[PDB]
Amino acid sequence: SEMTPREIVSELDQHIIGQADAKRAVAIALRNRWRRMQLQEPLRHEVTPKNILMIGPTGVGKTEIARRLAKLANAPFIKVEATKFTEVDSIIRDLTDSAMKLVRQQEIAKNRAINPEELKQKAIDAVEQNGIVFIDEIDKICKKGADVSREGVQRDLLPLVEGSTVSTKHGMVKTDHILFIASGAFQVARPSDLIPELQGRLPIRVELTALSAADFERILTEPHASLTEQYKALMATEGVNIAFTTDAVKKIAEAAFRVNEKTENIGARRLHTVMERLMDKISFSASDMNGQTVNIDAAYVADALGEVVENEDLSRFIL
Amino acid sequence: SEMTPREIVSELDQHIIGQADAKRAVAIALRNRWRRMQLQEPLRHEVTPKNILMIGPTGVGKTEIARRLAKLANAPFIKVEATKFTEVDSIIRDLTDSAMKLVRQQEIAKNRIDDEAAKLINPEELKQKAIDAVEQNGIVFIDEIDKICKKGADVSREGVQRDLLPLVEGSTVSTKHGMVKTDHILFIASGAFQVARPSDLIPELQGRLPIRVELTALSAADFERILTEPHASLTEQYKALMATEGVNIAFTTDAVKKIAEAAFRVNEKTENIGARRLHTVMERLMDKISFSASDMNGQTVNIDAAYVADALGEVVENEDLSRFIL
Amino acid sequence: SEMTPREIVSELDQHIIGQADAKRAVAIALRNRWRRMQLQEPLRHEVTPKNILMIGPTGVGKTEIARRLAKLANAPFIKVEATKFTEVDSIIRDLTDSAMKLVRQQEIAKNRIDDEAAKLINPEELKQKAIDAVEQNGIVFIDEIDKICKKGADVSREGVQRDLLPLVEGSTVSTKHGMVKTDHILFIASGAFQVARPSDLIPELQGRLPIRVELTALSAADFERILTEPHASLTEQYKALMATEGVNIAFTTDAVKKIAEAAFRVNEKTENIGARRLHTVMERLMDKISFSASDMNGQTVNIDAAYVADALGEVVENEDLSRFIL
Amino acid sequence: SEMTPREIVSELDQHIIGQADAKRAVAIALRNRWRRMQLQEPLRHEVTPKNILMIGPTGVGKTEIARRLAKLANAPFIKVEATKFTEVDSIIRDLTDSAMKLVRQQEIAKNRARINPEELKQKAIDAVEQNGIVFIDEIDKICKKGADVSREGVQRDLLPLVEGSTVSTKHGMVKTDHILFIASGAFQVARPSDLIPELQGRLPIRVELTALSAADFERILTEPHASLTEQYKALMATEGVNIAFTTDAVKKIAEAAFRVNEKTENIGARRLHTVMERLMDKISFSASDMNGQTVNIDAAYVADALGEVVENEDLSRFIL
Amino acid sequence: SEMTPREIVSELDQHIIGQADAKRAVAIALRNRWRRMQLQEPLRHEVTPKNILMIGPTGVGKTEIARRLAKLANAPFIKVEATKFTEVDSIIRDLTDSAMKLVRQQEIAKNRNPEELKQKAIDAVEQNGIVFIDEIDKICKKGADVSREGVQRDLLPLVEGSTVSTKHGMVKTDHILFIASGAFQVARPSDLIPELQGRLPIRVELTALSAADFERILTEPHASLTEQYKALMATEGVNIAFTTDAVKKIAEAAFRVNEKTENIGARRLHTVMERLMDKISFSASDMNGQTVNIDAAYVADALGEVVENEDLSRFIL
Ligand SMILES: Nc1ncnc2c1ncn2[C@@H]1O[C@H](COP(=O)(O)OP(=O)(O)OP(=O)(O)O)[C@@H](O)[C@H]1O
Ligand SMILES: Nc1ncnc2c1ncn2[C@@H]1O[C@H](COP(=O)(O)OP(=O)(O)OP(=O)(O)O)[C@@H](O)[C@H]1O
Ligand SMILES: Nc1ncnc2c1ncn2[C@@H]1O[C@H](COP(=O)(O)OP(=O)(O)OP(=O)(O)O)[C@@H](O)[C@H]1O
Ligand SMILES: Nc1ncnc2c1ncn2[C@@H]1O[C@H](COP(=O)(O)OP(=O)(O)OP(=O)(O)O)[C@@H](O)[C@H]1O
Ligand SMILES: Nc1ncnc2c1ncn2[C@@H]1O[C@H](COP(=O)(O)OP(=O)(O)OP(=O)(O)O)[C@@H](O)[C@H]1O
């Protein structure tokens, strides 16, 4: 009828490296969905979603985990920056909108081998029933004049979280049962700085960790459709056969990490950055470089990258 | 014909623990509705609702009591943040919209193949009836009104009050169903009022809110009860939830007593979020089982003080201190 | 053909206690309406309303008098805070809208299952008749105009005045029923004017508000009367309400004298909200009975000074002092 | 074909007392309209209105004169506070909206014999474009004297209109090119020479209006078609009372309005509507059951009904 | 096929007095239009307008020249205050709207169809539209300033060429000719954002209008003032005649004041005239048949002295 706690984490482990607690959290969450809606009418409607608040550094998974959860649950998903509102009902609106495309797409599948009404109500059903809403950087609309402008968005989100109704161009949808997942670094504010009303509709606090050299090494190759898995597949098209050696990855990764530490740690994005910086030349020539096989090793990588440029501060600003 | 003061309170006691004065308040209130509208035309329209202002701490019942009142009276209800307006007529608009659902759904079944049901309705009547619904027994719950009180940029708030007058005071607002009159809508306003006194609202309003009723902080002991008594209490819920995965669960008195003492415990030590703290502590305790409960079929978990005492781990506190003191 | 100066006052005396000059003012005013519109075309349109400005304390009648004047004249009425605009044409718009429900439910309950109703109507005429109603006998009450007076960010207010001129002064505004003209609407503006003088409004307006009339603070002795004289007074109402539950209630003179001396009492000690304070204290008194009156059938409660004195309790006041005093 | 400079003034003299130069200004102005539109195509469109800026005190005629001019010329008219904009195109919109009610108003008598909306509109549009009068009140306020560029902005905003542009109305496209504009203002702080040059020159005709005098009130009090006195008489008539104001009574009533205007907030001629309603107090109530009788309002009466004044409150309280 | 550089100046000379460099500039400009659009597809679209920035004092022709240029070219034309935006796409929108009328007014007399029209109108805009941005010097630089140096960034796309949606379809500012004007008494044109500063290649200056100049704008232009009053008083039956020395006087006068006070340029003639033709304009009605001989005496009278003297004193110690 549906996946299970441990069952879903597996699926998640397929695309995200590490960040366990988090995976579990959304798992037990997604699972409670099947549990309720399996209860009898009185409770089937009385029990409510156990919203999660993921705390963590930049780009280490919060979002993927969320987007994936939705994905493996074939659930209407939608992400929104909290600061985007410094019309909130739009969130639920957009969600429902997504809900159609979803239901619709999987309708022309059986209706190929219709009616408007059934669709809309069946999309609503989906929103109201299994919608995931991801509120990014909610830690930004926390507290720390012009502040009540932010501490306001919270009061503005309550009705959604807390359960209300918003009108969409497909009908009336109820936020009552939408699963919410709020994210944030919280380097300055504690989550215990949100308005109590919200602080309590965000029961599950889960933590995500900084990503390591060693970790990068993995995100670099394990994940279904990793970066290396991608370039290989991409240069392939041009006819070029490429191969990354262990030490090469180790190097690539030790490099991503290297800069993150020396400058603006942008988390795992730094891999997409270092990769494109490495796969630079080949990406161009790959075209008329048919047949060849590039053997990207530690030497290769160590060259393609060059020299880290740090210590710009000091001098210029110091006495 | 309709329930009664004491009668209604009973029904409320089913879902809210404590907060008596409050229950009564809304009870006498919902009762006066049946009393007028039982009077003769001159007065039937001359007498007006006795709106309520519930003063209290966070999540101790203010809203449930209202939401329930509405529910047990099958009345068009609607809640709105007071600060939401820092278009107010919307409140009445949304209300009417809800009365529709109520009045509609009230004739799609109780008064009676999916293509069956169309010209036997008369979509020219429903609305009218939906209006009456609103016009006659609408309950509006204005939350944290204490926030649009006083204490530049303040007149922006002391404004929402003047904006609400017309509703409370009695006016007409156009809805996509026609004209509805707030003249008889029952209004229930709520607020903590830790900074402002209710006697800080604009007099025009301060007198349209005649009934002042207080609600209490929720106690350890109180938690113990909200914990199990209420129709569909938390435990009553988890039990029902783990049931589905095949696990049979049971909470021992001492466990509840512990769970509660625990929620309370933290509330006092940090940000007292009222009863929400139970939903919080429960999800923290039911952690483990909630995962494994799936492949943990058949077994029966016996949640006792020991269990809880563990699942919750130790308390943290007074982070502050040091770092800010000399 | 219509009532008369002294004849209208009588009707007003039925619901308002005291506040005479005011009653007169709106009387002669309502009368002039019949006077013109009785004149020949040249003047029938040249002569304009003599708009009134009621200056008074809080809740002493300013609005009842207006709302009632309107009611006894079966005239489209509408009230608006002046500060509501710190779209003004909406005033006339909403007015026109009210003229519908008035005229509508006036050629349905007069000029007359719900199928023989589409007869006569002639929608394009109903409208053309409401527009007259507005244009001819509309009363617009502009509350707390003294607030949009003057005393930066002040021109925001001294602006709503310039914004109201065209209405007062006479112009046209488009309604969803057609074009209506403010030329003849009767305007009644009210305000306490504790800080600003009326002679602080913009001259343009200062002159279109010819009639100044003063209302008096409501006294203990006064309360005693608003408490029982007025058609459908408070006591008259409660009596009528407990009746329904089957309880027979009776207020002794000394009881009223007490209830009133009570309302006044607090009004003086705190935020004087005028007569609203009676609706307050009454509810605070009829507390118990209102609950139990249900299963308290047959009995008869005798509310005397003892009673009231009890049901109310003591008054709080010197909250101030201390804390902010050295 | 149309009235004349001296001919129109006559008509105006019928409702406004005094304020001559002004009447003339709008007269020559409404006349130039008939003059052009009588010329041949090249010029018929090349010559433009000679817009007026009336400078004056509060309520001494500026608007009546304008409202009336419009009226006597049966032209689409519209008045607007200049400060209302601190959507300007609305002016032309509302104007055109009026034209419609004005054309169609007279297109139901012509079509009484025994329509065609695609023409009607096309007509009101000609109406507006051809003889529209726009009255911009208190423009002296949007003059200059930060937050000031907010006002000196409305001017730049009005140019296109005054200067001649096109604005879309729900009846079609209309051209302000030929609309007649009359701007008014007290100008007690700013000189008209304070407006933006662009506008300072599209307001050629400067005409000044005078404060209203005791003597003047005496006249606004009885001469004007439908004067106040003429009105009350007409009003108490209905209740059956015959009333009569004696010369000296008028002289007194007026000396009185003036009196106060000088002593307090001079609101111009409105002060008469004020004093009249203050005097006609009593009678207005009792006139109802006072049938038959005849009240003889003389100097004594008025002197009574009015009482005494309050002329010197300040001092004290504020002075050391 | 179309007029020419020198050929257009002529036509302009007919309504504007002086301001030659200006006339030439729009001349070569309107001419370039015919030149391109005479080229072969690759270039017919590659070459773009050479936008003009006219710098000058108040009311000395900046706008007439432009409005006329447009007129004589039967082109969709539109003027806008630059500060009007302190929705910019409207300019192009309103322009299109205008071409619609210009394209109606022709297609109606031709016959003596929707699709064809809206499209046909659109080519008009896209192909020969003139947009006159006034007092752009105001949205130049000199906090709350980035609010102006913003309108520039807002105009770029138009000038620079983009597309905007009109209720008639999609139009492209790619080829619209833009003419911007401004006094520039405080800011230099070299103070606008570079992006724009390079899209306004042609800089042309207009001069202050002189006494002597006035004398001419006073009588030479088709439908000059005098020509106008004559024509107007004619209607009332009065025959009027201005004498040379009279015009010399009227003008000398206009100029006189401009110098002594708020120099509003040529408008000062519309001013002084109305001030002079005062009396006549009223009486002219029942003054039929007569003939008025407006000489220097007459003018010198009807105006009646006015030297500056206000300032100082009250403000000086
Ligand atoms: N542990 C990880 N496993 C797999 N992919 C990862 C991991 N961490 C980061 N990524 C990749 O890096 C990107 C991180 O996106 P994500 O938004 O989840 O970070 P975040 O912590 O949610 O950041 P923010 O809240 O600042 O947006 C994704 O493309 C993801 O595929
Ligand atoms: N005494 C109580 N008995 C039963 N349930 C309660 C009680 N107090 C709180 N709750 C539960 O805790 C939550 C309290 O939310 P609620 O909004 O009712 O509190 P509130 O005081 O009205 O809130 P706010 O602070 O937003 O006004 C609800 O889920 C309710 O079921
Ligand atoms: N003298 C009176 N006689 C009868 N009812 C009165 C009297 N004074 C007040 N009331 C009652 O008390 C309330 C007074 O409110 P009302 O709005 O009429 O006063 P107000 O002068 O308009 O106040 P505000 O200036 O604050 O609007 C009404 O409900 C009215 O029924
Ligand atoms: N000289 C006059 N003759 C006749 N009636 C007059 C005269 N002056 C004023 N009135 C009357 O008094 C009022 C004068 O107001 P008016 O419309 O003239 O304003 P205004 O003088 O233009 O002032 P502002 O522009 O400051 O509003 C009108 O009702 C008009 O009927
Ligand atoms: N050189 C001139 N020859 C003829 N007429 C002129 C001349 N200069 C100005 N005028 C007349 O004076 C008016 C000037 O308007 P114009 O729009 O040309 O001024 P501008 O210099 O563009 O002003 P702005 O400061 O608004 O840009 C027009 O009516 C025009 O006929």
Side-chain angles (χ1 to χ4, degrees), chain B residues 159-171:
Chain B
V160 187
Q161 296 190 59
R162 300 261 176 56
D163 285 286
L164 289 179
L165 274 176
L167 272 54
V168 157
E169 241 183 64
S171 62

Side-chain angles (χ1 to χ4, degrees), chain B residues 4-6 24 31 34-36 38-39 43 46-47 50 162 169 181 197 203-204 206 208, chain C residues 68 79 81 101 144 232 237-238 240-242 244-245 271 273 276 283 290-291 294-295 319:
Chain B
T4 102
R6 203 165 35 67
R24 224 156 173 290
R31 182 58 164 160
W34 165 82
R35 301 172 176 185
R36 131 177 189 282
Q38 191 102 177
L39 305 159
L43 292 179
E46 275 283 3
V47 58
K50 297 300 173 186
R162 300 261 176 56
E169 241 183 64
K181 323 198 297 181
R197 294 130 285 186
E204 283 69 0
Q206 174 167 164
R208 284 265 22 188
Chain C
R68 290 291 169 188
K79 172 165 160 184
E81 284 301 89
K101 183 181 63 183
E144 278 180 354
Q237 286 192 85
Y238 276 115
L241 268 304
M242 303 304 84
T244 341
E245 295 284 21
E271 186 77 67
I273 57 178
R276 266 309 177 177
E283 195 57 51
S290 207
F291 191 57
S294 198
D295 59 37
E319 168 200 71

Side-chain angles (χ1 to χ4, degrees), chain A residues 2 6 18 30-32 54 63 67 92 99 103 116 153 163 195 202 218 222 246 278 283 305 308:
Chain A
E2 189 56 272
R6 202 164 38 65
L30 180 43
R31 186 54 169 164
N32 277 323
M54 308 192 213
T63 309
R67 213 186 282 281
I92 304 311
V103 139
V153 195
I195 56 178
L202 295 198
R218 305 181 53 197
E222 309 197 7
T246 315
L278 162 171
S283 211
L305 301 192
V308 185

Side-chain angles (χ1 to χ4, degrees), chain B residues 35-231:
Chain B
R35 301 172 176 185
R36 131 177 189 282
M37 197 192 318
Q38 191 102 177
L39 305 159
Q40 276 302 178
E41 198 47 69
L43 292 179
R44 213 178 82 80
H45 231 67
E46 275 283 3
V47 58
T48 62
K50 297 300 173 186
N51 304 317
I52 305 146
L53 168 64
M54 309 175 180
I55 292 54
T58 320
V60 283
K62 303 199 205 65
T63 303
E64 271 289 315
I65 294 161
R67 212 184 285 275
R68 293 286 167 190
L69 181 82
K71 193 60 172 298
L72 74 88
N74 185 62
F77 178 78
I78 170 56
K79 172 170 171 189
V80 308
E81 207 97 333
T83 41
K84 182 186 180 186
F85 319 87
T86 317
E87 178 67 308
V88 118
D89 288 323
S90 83
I91 293 164
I92 311 306
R93 209 161 289 147
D94 293 342
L95 183 57
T96 305
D97 239 27
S98 182
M100 252 315 285
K101 180 186 166 188
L102 213 55
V103 181
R104 194 180 189 184
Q105 157 219 290
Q106 256 194 180
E107 274 202 52
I108 218 169
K110 219 295 185 170
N111 264 296
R112 118 137 207 161
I113 173 181
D114 289 357
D115 193 289
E116 172 52 56
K119 189 184 176 184
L120 60 156
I121 288 171
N122 178 40
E124 184 195 67
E125 164 196 60
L126 219 75
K127 281 178 183 177
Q128 173 75 297
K129 199 176 180 186
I131 294 180
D132 289 356
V134 175
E135 285 198 358
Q136 288 303 177
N137 359 297
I139 324 289
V140 161
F141 181 77
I142 293 174
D143 202 25
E144 272 172 1
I145 198 140
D146 66 314
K147 290 288 184 177
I148 70 180
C149 229
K150 296 92 280 184
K151 61 176 186 180
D154 179 294
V155 293
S156 307
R157 295 181 297 190
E158 179 163 4
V160 187
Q161 296 190 59
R162 300 261 176 56
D163 285 286
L164 289 179
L165 274 176
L167 272 54
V168 157
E169 241 183 64
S171 62
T172 313
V173 316
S174 185
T175 57
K176 71 180 177 181
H177 295 291
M179 305 298 283
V180 314
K181 323 198 297 181
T182 57
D183 274 77
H184 291 301
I185 298 301
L186 162 67
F187 285 90
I188 295 164
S190 97
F193 285 91
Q194 26 188 52
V195 273
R197 294 130 285 186
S199 59
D200 264 25
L201 309 151
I202 61 183
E204 283 69 0
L205 190 53
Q206 174 167 164
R208 284 265 22 188
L209 300 188
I211 292 186
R212 308 306 176 68
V213 55
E214 211 162 293
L215 280 85
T216 51
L218 247 28
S219 151
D222 289 291
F223 284 160
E224 286 181 39
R225 312 176 54 199
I226 350 287
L227 220 15
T228 70
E229 311 197 6
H231 277 203

Side-chain angles (χ1 to χ4, degrees), chain A residues 4-6 24 28 31-32 34-36 38-39 43 46-47 50 155 162 196-197 199-201, chain B residues 68 79 81 144 147 232 237-238 240-242 244-245 271 273 276 283 290-291 293-295 319:
Chain A
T4 95
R6 202 164 38 65
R24 222 150 173 291
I28 53 181
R31 186 54 169 164
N32 277 323
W34 163 80
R35 298 171 175 188
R36 146 187 175 276
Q38 196 100 180
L39 302 158
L43 298 178
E46 280 284 357
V47 58
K50 296 299 176 183
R155 302 253 173 60
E162 248 182 60
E197 285 66 354
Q199 181 163 161
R201 289 262 16 191
Chain B
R68 293 286 167 190
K79 172 170 171 189
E81 207 97 333
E144 272 172 1
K147 290 288 184 177
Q237 291 192 74
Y238 280 117
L241 265 310
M242 301 299 78
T244 336
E245 293 277 30
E271 185 80 68
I273 55 183
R276 271 303 180 179
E283 199 58 54
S290 204
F291 194 51
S294 196
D295 64 31
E319 168 205 55

Side-chain angles (χ1 to χ4, degrees), chain D residues 64-246:
Chain D
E64 271 292 306
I65 295 165
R67 211 180 287 271
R68 296 289 173 188
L69 181 75
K71 193 61 170 294
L72 70 85
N74 179 64
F77 176 73
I78 177 55
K79 168 180 178 179
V80 303
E81 210 103 338
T83 40
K84 184 188 178 196
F85 318 81
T86 321
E87 178 67 306
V88 119
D89 291 329
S90 73
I91 290 170
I92 310 310
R93 209 160 290 150
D94 292 346
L95 182 61
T96 303
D97 237 30
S98 183
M100 264 312 291
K101 175 168 79 173
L102 175 57
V103 163
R104 171 160 176 166
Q105 175 187 298
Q106 70 196 60
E107 197 56 45
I108 59 85
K110 165 182 175 173
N111 259 53
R112 147 65 191 177
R114 284 192 181 180
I115 322 180
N116 195 44
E118 285 292 302
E119 165 183 63
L120 193 58
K121 299 188 177 183
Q122 180 56 310
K123 189 174 181 183
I125 284 184
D126 267 335
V128 168
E129 284 192 356
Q130 289 304 174
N131 0 298
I133 333 298
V134 167
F135 186 61
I136 291 178
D137 204 18
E138 279 179 353
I139 202 159
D140 56 316
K141 294 290 191 175
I142 75 181
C143 206
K144 30 268 68 139
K145 58 178 186 177
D148 178 298
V149 292
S150 304
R151 292 180 295 189
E152 179 170 8
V154 205
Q155 297 187 55
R156 299 260 175 54
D157 282 286
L158 287 173
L159 278 168
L161 267 57
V162 154
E163 246 183 63
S165 60
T166 315
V167 327
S168 177
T169 60
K170 70 180 175 181
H171 295 298
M173 300 299 278
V174 307
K175 320 204 300 176
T176 62
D177 272 76
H178 288 310
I179 304 293
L180 165 60
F181 293 92
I182 294 163
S184 98
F187 287 87
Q188 25 184 50
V189 271
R191 297 127 284 186
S193 48
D194 265 7
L195 312 142
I196 57 183
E198 287 66 1
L199 188 61
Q200 173 165 164
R202 288 262 17 187
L203 297 189
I205 297 186
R206 312 307 180 62
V207 49
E208 197 171 302
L209 288 77
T210 58
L212 245 41
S213 155
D216 296 296
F217 282 169
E218 286 187 36
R219 310 184 46 210
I220 352 281
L221 211 21
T222 64
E223 318 191 6
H225 280 199
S227 67
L228 283 174
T229 37
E230 249 186 64
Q231 294 189 76
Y232 279 120
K233 263 188 170 75
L235 266 304
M236 303 298 74
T238 338
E239 299 278 29
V241 176
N242 188 280
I243 169 172
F245 298 92
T246 92

Side-chain angles (χ1 to χ4, degrees), chain A residues 108-239:
Chain A
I108 57 87
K110 90 85 188 299
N111 239 300
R112 185 57 191 72
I114 291 164
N115 165 48
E117 290 311 308
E118 201 97 74
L119 264 68
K120 286 172 285 295
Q121 188 65 58
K122 278 188 174 180
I124 281 182
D125 278 357
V127 167
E128 286 195 350
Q129 290 303 173
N130 359 292
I132 325 301
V133 161
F134 184 72
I135 291 175
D136 203 28
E137 286 182 351
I138 200 151
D139 59 318
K140 292 289 189 181
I141 75 178
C142 217
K143 294 92 282 185
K144 61 175 192 179
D147 177 298
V148 294
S149 303
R150 292 181 294 188
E151 183 169 0
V153 195
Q154 305 188 47
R155 302 253 173 60
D156 282 287
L157 286 173
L158 281 173
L160 268 50
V161 155
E162 248 182 60
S164 54
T165 313
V166 314
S167 179
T168 58
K169 67 179 179 183
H170 296 291
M172 299 302 277
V173 303
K174 318 203 301 177
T175 54
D176 274 76
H177 291 303
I178 302 310
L179 163 69
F180 288 82
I181 297 177
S183 121
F186 288 90
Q187 15 191 63
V188 275
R190 295 127 286 186
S192 53
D193 271 9
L194 306 150
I195 56 178
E197 285 66 354
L198 189 59
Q199 181 163 161
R201 289 262 16 191
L202 295 198
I204 303 180
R205 311 307 178 58
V206 52
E207 203 167 299
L208 290 89
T209 61
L211 250 42
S212 145
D215 293 294
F216 279 163
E217 283 188 40
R218 305 181 53 197
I219 355 282
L220 213 19
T221 61
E222 309 197 7
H224 277 200
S226 76
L227 282 177
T228 51
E229 247 187 63
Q230 292 189 74
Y231 281 123
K232 261 191 172 78
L234 261 315
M235 302 300 82
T237 333
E238 293 280 20

